[PDB]
Design a protein around this nucleic acid. Structure first.
Ligand SMILES: [Mg+2]
Ligand SMILES: [Mg+2]
Ligand SMILES: [Mg+2]
Ligand SMILES: [Mg+2]
Ligand SMILES: [Mg+2]
Ligand SMILES: [Mg+2]
Ligand SMILES: [Mg+2]
Ligand SMILES: [Mg+2]
Ligand SMILES: [Mg+2]
Ligand SMILES: [Mg+2]
Ligand SMILES: [Mg+2]
Ligand SMILES: [Mg+2]
Ligand SMILES: [Mg+2]
Ligand SMILES: [Mg+2]
Ligand SMILES: [Mg+2]
Ligand SMILES: [Mg+2]
Ligand SMILES: [Mg+2]
Ligand SMILES: [Mg+2]
Ligand SMILES: [Mg+2]
Ligand SMILES: [Mg+2]
Ligand SMILES: [Mg+2]
Ligand SMILES: [Mg+2]
Ligand SMILES: [Mg+2]
Lengths: 206, 262, 177, 143
RNA sequence: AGGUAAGGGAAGUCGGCAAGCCGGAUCCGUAACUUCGGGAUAAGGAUUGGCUCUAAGGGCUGGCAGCCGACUUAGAACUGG
RNA sequence: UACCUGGUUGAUCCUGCCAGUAGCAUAUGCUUGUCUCAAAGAUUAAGCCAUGCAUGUCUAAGUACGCACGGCCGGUACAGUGAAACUGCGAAUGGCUCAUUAAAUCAGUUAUGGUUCCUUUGGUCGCUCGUACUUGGAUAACUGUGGUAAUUCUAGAGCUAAUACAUGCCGACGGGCGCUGACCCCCUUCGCGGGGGGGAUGCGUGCAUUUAUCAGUGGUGACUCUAGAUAACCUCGGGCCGAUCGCACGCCGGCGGCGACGACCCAUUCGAACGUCUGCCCUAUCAACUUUCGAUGGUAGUCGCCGUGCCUACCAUGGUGACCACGGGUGACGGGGAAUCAGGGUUCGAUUCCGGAGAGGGAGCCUGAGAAACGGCUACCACAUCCAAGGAAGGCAGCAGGCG
RNA sequence: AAGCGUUUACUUUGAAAAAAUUAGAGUGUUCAAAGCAGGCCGCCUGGAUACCGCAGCUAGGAAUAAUGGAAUAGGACCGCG
């Protein structure tokens, strides 16, 4: 089948090298996993040395980390917005390493509000009736109030992240290879890299 | 080759085994173990060809599987068990303990030691590893990975291990002035004190060694085995004391001995 | 050529068959073979037709239902014997295992019983206690070894720190010199 | 300057998104007494195959060559000259091998026809297995 | 005066007369010979619809921002008997 | 032993070649008494094959109700042999041949800090905080109905076990460590405030995998090494945390020995694979070759055990060559080696040792740690067997043997 | 005692570099071709050594053969602001 052969192509000088042996098993290639977005469907494949590899086909959630404050939660993925390799990987939603995806910021907002007791997102004009945010923001004891006051001094966040939180979803870059490990772990884009990728998105939109 | 090799030709066998050419086509392939293929001597070779306790493979099998041989304080029932350098092989029926030490030449020699000496052996540490919970680990040359070692021990040192408990007792630091055994190469069997160390970054470093008769030589680190502090070893040396005297000095001494005997 | 269930044909078709597929007995592990099987639809072109009666009629046919052939073997597993004779969790099972009598020309009558498998026996209990003893002794030796290393590390570190302290004292002497 | 590709060019080791209220640069010494260039430490570029600021380790052999072509990006071609002895005629043959080495952008100003030291590493591409360690000028050419 | 004809494909006839076959464009490829200019659209191949995308090809104003204007070329997916 | 001789001419001195001389091999002719070794279908046909064999395997330590043998001490199972079968492993070793292959294979030298690794040996195997005195049902060998012209072809019905296929727990385990923290106590200010302590509850808290962050126990010449902490993840086409077996059997229902087997992870051993540099016959009537049908690189990915245009997408136009690139031929497996030999070289190396390739020609693949395996399958081409004409079955460049 | 010295060819050593084979040590296979044994009234021993091109490593030499120093002084050395 498909093989990774260094003997099947020309030399450095460009001459044609005739093969001296058949296609060996150890030099093998496999069809691309071609991950999609949907209900999880992962196939295990026997590998050299008796090992196993997890090939993802459709994936719904992933473990994405907020680098600035060191917090990660299992978050669902909705769309893929950019891919430096090719635009076909953007037109068809495919998860690959070093690809940009959109994830809802609900777990990040819950952690931030439970940690710094500050409103993240929450476009003005609405109040939560079930007062689940009210209890998470109020009822602080006096002794711990200065502890939260110390936290809220540095609890400030960037404007771009604040806008993404208000929108309800934020950008992230997948750092793992779903076709190898089976997961879609990644990190939240921030700073110069985030605004660079925003520039690429805006240029693509035109 | 579509897999690992399981045979070994008589000709392809290592020379220090001293295997006859006409007896057979295949040599006893050593089993995998704590010593390399060429650095080990099969237990069948040790008992049949050298000690002459047996005659053929059937007799060697009977001796080995009767639970009479005891290597490193343990009984191995495999005929072709790999016996390596500085190993203790004991036969309790005859009360005979052997320490596998190279003689002046490159082949192994019969070295009978007392039961008091046979309770311990010497090993050279190969690497230092750190376990899953910050536990230091010391790996010897015979695949003995003893954990919680002495912090003073380093990569290129040696230790004394009690066979019964498998625990270290004392150690020798790799430094100039201590005896060292060249357990491999052209100087196989040489014994002498380390007189110089040359550092070659990237490549393997070398050590200049001066023997007891002033015949200095050089050896790389991978073929060095220190055998005690100072000028005295921690083990009973065999005949010759690792000198490798010249061919003329070997020839005249045996001629004089034969003439004196008559 | 035998009929194969799940083919939805009436003729002859060649199939790749592996371990677990009917109408094929593999020789070596992983071996797959091309075997020509027949469709699962019954037609006039059949040599022998397999039929299994599951509902009994009113008449006693003298071929099948007239005589009941006893089952050749009895239960061997202790759990299956318990299920067969409705044993409880406390009553013994060794007295209720069915043994087949032996009788033929010449030799004496004999009764033979299978070995009861997966029962509560002293050897199993001893093995379980021995391996739990191994489990606890591993922790005991690990704790002792860790304590010994802690003493050794403390000895080495205090030796190093006092040697460093006298080095610092020498540095202080140089500074004051 | 930097960030000219589709993806974002950054050092994967250091973290650049730490909250405040310049950017730290990752570099290492390759050993064997080779002093790291000041450009590789005070520069703003990134490179995966740079010997000092990349995920490449120099190990094996150390060679020297003469740069002949500088058209390839992030890599140059050097020519190594040697003499082959024939046992029959007690003389020599002048043979050469043209190998492509990875010229890290830390060495900014390099011309063709000068001695350059290279070291073996992992295979970076189909016919690249060496990295430039230090650069020395040719005869004169100090202008 | 136009066509269509199963199977054979010039076996008809002085004679492939007539009729029939190819045919546009794009991407490959193109021999004997030669006056070296040609032969050459040699010969021989493949693609062509519809729909939805992507990339590239510029001006005017104040390596940057905004506003405009046209026709094309290439690549990809989906789909039709 | 650093060796010559006859021959052009009427005669001579030369160049010059022919023929003489001697080994080493191949075949042949004649002859052939003893004895010790010993090559032996490579040279043309890697052409085709009747036949027979060449890979099976059980120890007290995985399964034993086949009376196929066999003991009686029974009634609280199983004496001990044991055909067959399931299970585990080997069959990827070895042997044969040289067809292909000219920086390819191979030879010397190195690195995997760029990877895997069955077995052996040694480390780990109460580290996790939430019916176990033993959990489930299918199957072979067995009985019985047959079908086919036939095969190591098999079906339907009954049973019956696992160290075969799955589910799954008591214990250590009583508490620590981190976040959470209702609350409480003390000092001080007129006072907010500030400072210092105890603590309800909940969650997480093993190793292995993935992701991001912080500091820098033991190291290498050099790590993005090893180790520690932080926040989660842990694939249902799932990971380990023992639901196994044997020999003697004791001490206060519980503790107990020697082992065997399996297994996540880490070192070790047999290796395997890409790799760095150097080295190969003849040929110019082969001088330019490779290159958007990957050629030289860059960036980011897919796949691969790993690094690499191995492949994809987008960019730059590079890469090799008169130091012979590239193409072509080889009556070319490479080498360690052999013959001849003064010194230098020439020729051979099919061949018992190592590394490479293959089983008529390619191609594809299950199993397994290890195969693109062929005394393993799946196709097409050539050859070819039995036949009821419906089908089935083959690969001696293995050991003997047959045809050509 | 640890680190540094223009780079190489060359020359010498050392290290490493499979066996079998070649040369060669010992050895009455009744001699020899051979083989690795064997000899003594349990003991005494062998199973050595040399070469192994070419390429790479290390350590002495700088005779010979290539190459640079500084010459629009962006030259050393010594301290200074
Ligand atoms: Mg017609
Ligand atoms: Mg028609
Ligand atoms: Mg006609
Ligand atoms: Mg016409
Ligand atoms: Mg024409
Ligand atoms: Mg004449
Ligand atoms: Mg005449
Ligand atoms: Mg002649
Ligand atoms: Mg006679
Ligand atoms: Mg032949
Ligand atoms: Mg073989
Ligand atoms: Mg040929
Ligand atoms: Mg050939
Ligand atoms: Mg010569
Ligand atoms: Mg050969
Ligand atoms: Mg041939
Ligand atoms: Mg071979
Ligand atoms: Mg054949
Ligand atoms: Mg093969
Ligand atoms: Mg095959
Ligand atoms: Mg065969
Ligand atoms: Mg075979
Ligand atoms: Mg040799």
């Amino acid at each position: 089948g498909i093989s990774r052969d260094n003997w099947h192509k020309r030399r450095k000088t460009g001459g044609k090298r005739k093969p001296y042996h058949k296609k060996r098993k150890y030099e093998l290639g496999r069809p691309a996993a071609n991950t999609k977005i949907g209900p999880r469907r992962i196939h295990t494949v026997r590998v050299r040395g008796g090992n196993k590899k997890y090939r993802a086909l459709r994936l719904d959630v992933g473990n994405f980390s907020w680098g600035s404050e060191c917090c990660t939660r299992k978050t669902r993925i909705i769309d893929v917005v950019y891919n430096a390799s090719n635009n076909e990987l953007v037109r068809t939603k495919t998860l690959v390493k070093n690809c940009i995806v959109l994830i809802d910021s609900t777990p990040y907002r819950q952690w931030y509000e439970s940690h710094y007791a500050l409103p993240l997102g929450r476009k003005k004009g609405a109040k939560l009736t079930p007062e689940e945010e009210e209890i998470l923001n109020k009822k602080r004891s006096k002794k711990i109030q200065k502890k939260y006051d110390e936290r809220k001094k540095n609890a400030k966040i960037s404007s771009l992240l604040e806008e993404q939180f208000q929108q309800g979803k934020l950008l992230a870059c997948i750092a793992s290879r779903p076709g190898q490990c089976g997961r879609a772990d990644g990190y939240v884009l921030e700073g110069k890299e985030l605004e660079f990728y925003l520039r690429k998105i805006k240029a693509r939109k035109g | 080759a579509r897999g690992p090799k399981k045979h070994l030709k008589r000709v392809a066998a290592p020379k220090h085994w001293m295997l006859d050419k006409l007896t057979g086509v295949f040599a006893p392939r050593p089993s995998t173990g704590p010593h390399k293929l060429r650095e080990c001597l099969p237990l069948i070779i040790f008992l049949r060809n050298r000690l002459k306790y047996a005659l053929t493979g059937d007799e060697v099998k009977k001796i080995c599987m009767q639970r009479f041989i005891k290597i490193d304080g343990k009984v191995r029932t495999d005929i072709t068990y790999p016996a390596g350098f500085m190993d203790v092989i004991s036969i309790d029926k005859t009360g005979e303990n052997f320490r596998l030490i190279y003689d002046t030449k490159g082949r192994f020699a019969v070295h009978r030691i007392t039961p008091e000496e046979a309770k311990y052996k010497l090993c050279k540490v190969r690497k230092i590893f750190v376990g899953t919970k910050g536990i230091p680990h010391l790996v010897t040359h015979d695949a003995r990975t003893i954990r919680y070692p002495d912090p003073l021990i380093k990569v290129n040192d040696t230790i004394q291990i009690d066979l019964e408990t498998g625990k270290i007792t004392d150690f020798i630091k790799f430094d100039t002035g201590n005896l060292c055994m060249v357990t491999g190469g052209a100087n196989l069997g040489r014994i002498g004190v380390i007189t110089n160390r040359e550092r070659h970054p990237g490549s393997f470093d070398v050590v200049h060694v001066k023997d007891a008769n002033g015949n200095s030589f050089a050896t790389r680190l991978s073929n060095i085995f220190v055998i005690g502090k100072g000028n005295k070893p921690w083990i009973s040396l065999p005949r010759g004391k690792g000198i490798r005297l010249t061919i003329a000095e070997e020839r005249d001494k045996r001629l004089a001995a034969k003439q004196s005997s008559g | 050529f035998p009929m194969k269930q799940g083919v939805l044909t009436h003729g002859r078709v060649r199939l790749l068959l592996s371990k677990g597929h009917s109408c094929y007995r593999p020789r070596r592990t992983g071996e797959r073979k091309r075997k020509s099987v027949r469709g699962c639809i019954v037609d006039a072109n059949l040599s022998v037709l397999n039929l299994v009666i599951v509902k009994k009629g009113e008449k006693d046919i003298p071929g099948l239902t007239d005589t009941t052939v006893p089952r050749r073997l009895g239960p061997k597993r202790a759990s299956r014997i318990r299920k067969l004779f409705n044993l409880s969790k406390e009553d013994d099972v060794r007295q209720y295992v069915v043994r087949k009598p032996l009788n033929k020309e010449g030799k004496k009558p004999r009764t033979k019983a299978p070995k009861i498998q997966r029962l509560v026996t002293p050897r199993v209990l001893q093995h379980k206690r021995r391996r739990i003893a191994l489990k606890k002794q591993r922790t005991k030796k690990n704790k002792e070894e860790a304590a010994e290393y802690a003493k050794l590390l403390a000895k080495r570190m205090k030796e190093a720190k006092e040697k460093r302290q006298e080095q610092i004292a020498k540095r202080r002497r140089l500074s004051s010199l | 300057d930097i960030q000219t590709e589709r993806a974002y060019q950054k050092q994967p080791t250091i973290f650049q998104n730490k909250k405040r209220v310049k950017l730290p640069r990752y570099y290492k010494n390759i050993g064997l007494g080779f002093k790291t260039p000041k450009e590789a430490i005070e520069g703003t570029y990134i490179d995966k195959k740079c010997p000092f600021t990349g995920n490449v380790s120099i190990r094996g052999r150390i060679l020297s060559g003469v740069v002949t072509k500088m058209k390839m990006q992030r890599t140059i071609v050097i020519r190594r000259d040697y003499l082959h002895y024939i046992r029959k005629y007690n003389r020599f043959e002048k043979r050469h091998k043209n190998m492509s080495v990875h010229l890290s952008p830390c060495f900014r100003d390099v011309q063709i026809g000068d001695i350059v030291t290279v070291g073996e590493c992992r295979p970076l591409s189909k016919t690249v297995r060496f990295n430039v360690l230090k650069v020395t000028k040719a005869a004169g050419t100090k202008k």
